[PDB]
Design an enzyme around this catalytic site. Structure first.
Site, short mmCIF file in Angstrom:
data_model
loop_
_atom_site.label_atom_id
_atom_site.label_comp_id
_atom_site.label_asym_id
_atom_site.label_seq_id
_atom_site.Cartn_x
_atom_site.Cartn_y
_atom_site.Cartn_z
N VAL A 1 0.82 -1.22 0.00
CA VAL A 1 0.00 0.00 0.00
C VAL A 1 0.85 1.27 0.00
CG1 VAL A 1 -1.86 -1.12 1.27
CG2 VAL A 1 -0.06 0.11 2.51
N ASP B 1 0.84 9.39 12.10
CA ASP B 1 1.96 10.11 11.49
C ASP B 1 2.74 9.22 10.53
OD1 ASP B 1 4.13 11.95 10.99
OD2 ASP B 1 3.81 12.80 12.99
#
Ligand code: G2G
Length: 330
Positions: free
Chosen positions: A26, A158
């Protein structure tokens, strides 16, 4: 100890437990969690112990994720290593619930309704209030650091869209003495963006960015001007005092007036006067979702290590410590 199985995805080798299946890239990989029957996200830390920096950076992220437990903040499902000892401890894998997409894609589909903006910004503030409790500042809050799925549920994270565009000015120019409201400022830039569909301050560099910010919020005043330590910035500010400012009710014409009020209180140059995460949660704009009893703070977080200077093998060991002491969530 489980039982892993090798595999090579796009050059990267992967050694994860049979518990995880269907690894699909991904660098992070999408997988199926056979123990819960839920889809997960598996991030293999690149070169975690290549330098003292990566070692500390690797340790820092593990300690954080292990401490985050809030519905609006990324949580650690599992942390494993194919290593059977510390010596052979060269790989680190982290696991979490899979998610829909950045607030980027999930916005590319539209501009978002006022109720969607309320609910989204409301979950950012709820997750923000929580992490700010442990005196943790994100410093990089931006569309691509927000995961949202179909249900419209959000979570902060993050990844390590110019972060610039959302960066507070105290932090962008650096005076070394900021605060947690650096994050709120970013929230105002995102909120504004959801309501308008277009980026509030799309600067090209740090000089351009500031011009954009001032043309909206205006040039610093006596009160804000006598709080700037560095003369270098002090001089620049007092020089370029030429930028036709604005009045929010106009800049955001047609938006929920409660919404433009919130912004007004978020997009202040004076971090000493900027609204906080807990205070914004009580803003009438969110009256529809606000619940002071379901807006939890975090346990205190130990950031002592941030100041230590250790060898690569020491940060490595503490990291191994954290890996073994991991207690999976219920
Ligand atoms: C040096 C340091 C220190 C801390 C640090 N912080 N700090 C935080 C806060 C608590 C402050 C928010 C979070 C955080 N790091 C973090 O969340 N790390 C991850 C990010 C991102 C993914 C991650 C990637 C793709 C996907 C797949 N896509 C599908 C489409 O939607 C977007 C996501 N999912 C998840 C991830 C996965 C497993 C494990 C970890 C992950 C990062 C670096």
């Amino acid at each position: 100890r489980p039982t892993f199985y090798r595999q090579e995805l796009a050059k990267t080798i992967w050694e994860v437990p049979e518990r995880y299946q269907n690894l699909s890239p991904v660098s992070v990989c999408a997988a199926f969690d056979t123990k819960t029957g839920h889809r997960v996200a598996v991030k293999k830390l690149s070169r975690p112990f290549q330098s003292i920096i990566h070692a500390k950076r690797t340790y820092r992220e593990l300690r954080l994720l292990k401490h985050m437990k809030h519905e609006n903040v990324i949580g650690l499902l599992d942390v494993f290593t194919p290593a059977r000892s510390l010596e052979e401890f060269n790989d680190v894998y982290l696991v979490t619930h899979l998610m829909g997409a950045d607030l980027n894609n999930i916005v590319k589909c539209a501009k978002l309704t006022d109720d969607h903006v309320q609910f989204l910004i409301y979950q950012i503030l709820r997750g923000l209030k929580y992490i700010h409790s442990a005196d943790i500042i994100h410093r990089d809050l931006k569309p691509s650091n927000l995961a949202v799925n179909e249900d419209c549920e959000l979570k902060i994270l993050d990844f390590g869209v110019a972060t610039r565009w959302y960066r507070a000015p105290e932090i962008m120019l650096n005076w070394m003495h900021y605060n947690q409201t650096v994050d709120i400022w970013s929230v105002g830039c995102i909120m504004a963006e959801l309501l308008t569909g277009r980026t509030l301050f799309p600067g090209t560099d740090h000089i351009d960015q500031l011009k954009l910010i001032l043309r909206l919020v205006g040039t610093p005043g006596a009160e804000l001007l006598k709080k700037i330590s560095s003369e270098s910035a002090r001089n620049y500010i007092q020089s370029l005092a030429q930028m036709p400012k604005m009045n929010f009710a106009n800049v955001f014409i047609g938006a929920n007036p409660l919404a433009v009020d919130l912004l007004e209180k978020m997009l202040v140059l004076d971090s000493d006067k900027r609204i906080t995460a807990a205070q914004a949660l009580a803003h009438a704009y969110f009256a529809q979702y606000h619940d002071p009893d379901d807006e939890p703070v975090a346990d205190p977080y130990d950031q002592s290590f941030e100041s230590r200077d250790l060898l690569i093998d020491e940060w490595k060991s503490l990291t191994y410590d954290e890996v073994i002491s991991f207690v999976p969530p219920p």
